[PDB]
Amino acid sequence: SVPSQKTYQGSYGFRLGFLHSGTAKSVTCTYSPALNKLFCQLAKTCPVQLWVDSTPPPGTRVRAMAIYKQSQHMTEVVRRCPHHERCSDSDGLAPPQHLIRVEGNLRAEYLDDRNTFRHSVVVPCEPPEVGSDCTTIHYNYMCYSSCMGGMNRRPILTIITLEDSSGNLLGRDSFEVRVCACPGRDRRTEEENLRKK
Ligand SMILES: C=CCOc1cc(C(=O)O)c(O)c(I)c1-n1cccc1
Ligand SMILES: [Zn+2]
């Protein structure tokens, strides 16, 4: 099977937001609205904002999962490559096979789905801090898009779902991801390729 990627704001008006980090050579994470695509370096902080129009109930959670973007690969589980799954870079909580980690949240839970074998990471919703209007989750991507025997240059999407306490769907959003050495240059190149076309 294949997880849905349909954008769904749901009853709470759920959607993502991204910072405006620019495309300088030194940037470590940068989001392209024109491409709906995040470009980031390996194992660097990726801030993803969560926005709602109304407060979801206590016990609501936010899950992240990666799938391959191309239809001919969508049934394959996205996982870390044979090198990175063995490199002993564990944070004590994420299984070494998982591509997506949450940084700095001891309540993150990592799921290996017993039926689909897909990986995901889920955290409890927490309201914005005083003086803020949204909540931010910090994700890390633990393989390059190019890693041989893993993503192997195939594009991926990240699907972010807002879920109730039983795991039922409340909202969904998504974005493409490229994990690469020079996200600023790659964002500029791909936005130029989208122009021209
Ligand atoms: C159960 C926890 C309440 O979750 C929120 C409350 C508010 C609020 O304004 O009351 C909000 O703005 C946000 I964004 C969240 N939220 C956190 C992650 C996804 C949504
Ligand atoms: Zn790798």
Side-chain angles (χ1 to χ4, degrees), residues 1-24 26-113 115-128 130-184 186-194:
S1 70
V2 172
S4 173
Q5 60 182 91
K6 178 180 180 53
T7 298
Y8 173 55
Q9 289 207 351
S11 300
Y12 304 102
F14 176 72
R15 72 280 185 180
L16 303 178
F18 298 86
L19 301 176
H20 304 273
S21 304
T23 61
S26 57
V27 78
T28 63
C29 179
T30 187
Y31 174 74
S32 171
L35 300 164
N36 187 32
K37 184 164 180 173
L38 186 71
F39 297 79
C40 61
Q41 288 176 354
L42 175 69
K44 299 295 178 63
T45 302
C46 298
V48 178
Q49 301 175 335
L50 309 171
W51 290 89
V52 295
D53 293 328
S54 55
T55 303
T60 308
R61 301 202 294 176
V62 176
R63 184 177 305 275
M65 180 184 291
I67 65 169
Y68 287 112
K69 181 178 189 134
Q70 299 164 287
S71 57
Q72 64 274 30
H73 300 297
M74 212 173 268
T75 60
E76 180 175 335
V77 173
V78 178
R79 59 172 60 260
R80 292 180 87 191
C81 75
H83 165 66
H84 282 116
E85 73 166 10
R86 299 185 63 244
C87 75
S88 302
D89 58 10
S90 167
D91 60 6
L93 187 51
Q97 302 95 323
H98 280 222
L99 176 70
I100 304 178
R101 299 182 184 176
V102 168
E103 203 172 358
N105 189 337
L106 300 173
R107 295 202 294 165
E109 297 178 5
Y110 290 84
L111 178 64
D112 290 331
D113 193 285
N115 298 123
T116 70
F117 311 107
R118 292 188 190 269
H119 305 162
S120 59
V121 55
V122 59
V123 299
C125 296
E126 291 162 9
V130 177
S132 295
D133 294 322
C134 70
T135 292
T136 301
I137 298 178
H138 300 104
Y139 292 108
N140 295 336
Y141 292 84
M142 304 299 304
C143 263
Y144 288 112
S145 290
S146 64
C147 276
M148 308 154 64
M151 287 182 284
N152 194 28
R153 307 190 174 275
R154 295 176 287 182
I156 60 158
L157 309 174
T158 298
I159 302 167
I160 307 293
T161 49
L162 189 69
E163 299 181 341
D164 71 17
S165 60
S166 289
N168 300 308
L169 170 77
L170 301 176
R172 192 188 297 104
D173 204 341
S174 62
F175 53 99
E176 184 174 346
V177 181
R178 172 176 173 77
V179 189
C180 56
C182 306
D186 287 352
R187 176 177 166 196
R188 278 184 267 115
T189 297
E190 298 193 18
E191 289 187 354
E192 213 39 61
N193 293 343
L194 177 65

